[PDB]
């Protein structure tokens, strides 16, 4: 929805991913836009995808 | 004369597991959760919790 905050959506997507895909918020030391999104998956190479 | 400047001060810099972060020194605790860390050289490394 257009009025919702990241905070609320963060809980929602954990359900949407089922926790099978792991995501968290990380910074670049970047003032003004300190949020960056990381998405992670596992296998012996890029094929984690 | 800048030659008198034997050495200049600069930071240590690191990633938060992928995304980079520059700080004055080789010690970090901004992770929260209860986690503490110290740096000893410029490299890549993996650590584990049990």
UniProtKB/Swiss-Prot annotation, chain A:
- The highest taxon in the source lineage is Bacteria
- What subcellular locations does the record give? Secreted; Bacterial flagellum
- Give the family this protein belongs to, as stated in its UniProt record: Belongs to the FliD family.
Subunit (UniProt): Homopentamer.
- Briefly, what is this protein's role? Required for the morphogenesis and for the elongation of the flagellar filament by facilitating polymerization of the flagellin monomers at the tip of growing filament. Forms a capping structure, which prevents flagellin subunits (transported through the central channel of the flagellum) from leaking out without polymerization at the distal end.
Q: What is this protein called?
A: Flagellar hook-associated protein 2
Question: Top-down, what is the taxonomic lineage of the species of origin?
Answer: Bacteria, Pseudomonadati, Campylobacterota, Epsilonproteobacteria, Campylobacterales
UniProtKB/Swiss-Prot annotation, chain B:
Q: Indicate the transmembrane segments per the record.
A: none
Q: Where does the record say this protein resides?
A: Secreted; Bacterial flagellum
Q: How does it assemble?
A: Homopentamer.
Q: Which family does it belong to?
A: Belongs to the FliD family.
State the function annotated in the UniProt record: Required for the morphogenesis and for the elongation of the flagellar filament by facilitating polymerization of the flagellin monomers at the tip of growing filament. Forms a capping structure, which prevents flagellin subunits (transported through the central channel of the flagellum) from leaking out without polymerization at the distal end.
Protein name from the UniProt record: Flagellar hook-associated protein 2
The taxonomic lineage of its organism, from the top, reads: Bacteria, Pseudomonadati, Campylobacterota, Epsilonproteobacteria, Campylobacterales
